[PDB]
């Protein structure tokens, strides 16, 4: 499969309630593997997946020191953002960052990522060239000038093409029993009368990993996108995900409808129907 590593940073200010909370979580694909929280009793980067626990004490010291530095850096960034947007010290604000790397089917770099947001809106992004920037507004243009002057993009490129890929490959090998295993969806169709005139057909996909999936209904072979209720893919709590798609069908017409499922864990796409 095609694998990714991501780090997510968030700082949330809370004037009058102490200093801004800073969190970090790391993922490989849909598996969280490390967490840090400045509101922890003793903040430290901590393991969240069995395959990261074998990294020695010096790994944890380095990750913790980075996260403790980042707590201070992102608090400074929240202060800067107030100046950039002419905002007072009374309001609560949020800065977010995502970065990491995607690998292709042969383990080579597919692309890298480095993006920030402020108050939930895109702020600045490193372009796919890993060499230039896209700023969302005139505030981020100030940041862009600073980062061009300091040749920030060159350093992020070196990380994304080097350590990011190398460490992702290490993690994939250490977690090869789980990270490199796709679990296919367990699929079935349920039938729920709504009245004498109509019933809901609900097509279920359960127990799958990773989260990417396609689940659709057809009537007489024609896609029913506008008439399908499609819930967001949701975590089950056991590593796996769930999703369903529902259509309202006239009584007696159930066999005109087919559900279609695509997932990495399936060798071929599936077709299912209501089986009374």
């Amino acid at each position: 499969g095609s694998h990714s590593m991501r780090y997510f940073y968030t700082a949330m200010s809370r004037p009058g309630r102490g200093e801004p909370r800073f969190i970090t979580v790391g993922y490989v694909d849909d598996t969280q593997f490390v967490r840090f929280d400045s509101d922890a009793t003793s903040p430290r980067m901590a393991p969240r997946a069995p395959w990261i626990e074998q990294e020695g004490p010096e790994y944890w010291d380095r990750e913790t020191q980075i996260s403790k530095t980042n707590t201070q850096t992102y608090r400074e960034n929240l202060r800067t953002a107030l100046r950039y947007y002419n905002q007072s010290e009374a309001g609560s604000h949020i800065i977010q960052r995502m970065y990491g790397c995607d690998l292709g089917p042969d383990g080579r770099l597919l692309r890298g990522h480095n993006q920030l947001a402020y108050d939930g809106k895109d702020y600045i992004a490193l372009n796919e060239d890993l060499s230039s920037w896209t700023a969302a507004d005139t505030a981020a243009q100030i940041t862009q000038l600073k980062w061009e002057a300091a040749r920030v993009a060159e350093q992020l490129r070196a990380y994304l093409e080097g350590e990011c890929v190398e460490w992702l490959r290490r993690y994939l090998e250490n977690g090869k029993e789980t990270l490199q295993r796709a679990d296919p969806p367990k699929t079935h169709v349920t039938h729920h009368p709504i009245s004498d005139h109509e019933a809901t057909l609900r097509c279920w996909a359960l127990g799958f990993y990773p989260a990417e999936i396609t689940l659709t209904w057809q009537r007489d072979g024609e896609d029913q996108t506008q008439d399908t209720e499609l819930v967001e893919t949701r975590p089950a709590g056991d590593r796996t995900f769930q999703k369903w798609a529902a259509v309202v069908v006239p009584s007696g017409e159930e066999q005109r409808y087919t559900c279609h499922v695509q997932h990495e864990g399936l060798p071929k796409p599936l077709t299912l129907r209501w089986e009374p």
């Binding site: 990750e63 980042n70 800067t80 950039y84 800065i95 702020y123």
Partner: peptide
């Protein structure tokens, strides 16, 4: 593992 480069906006 994380990048070490400090980003100040």
């Amino acid at each position: 593992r994380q990048d070490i480069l400090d980003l100040w906006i």
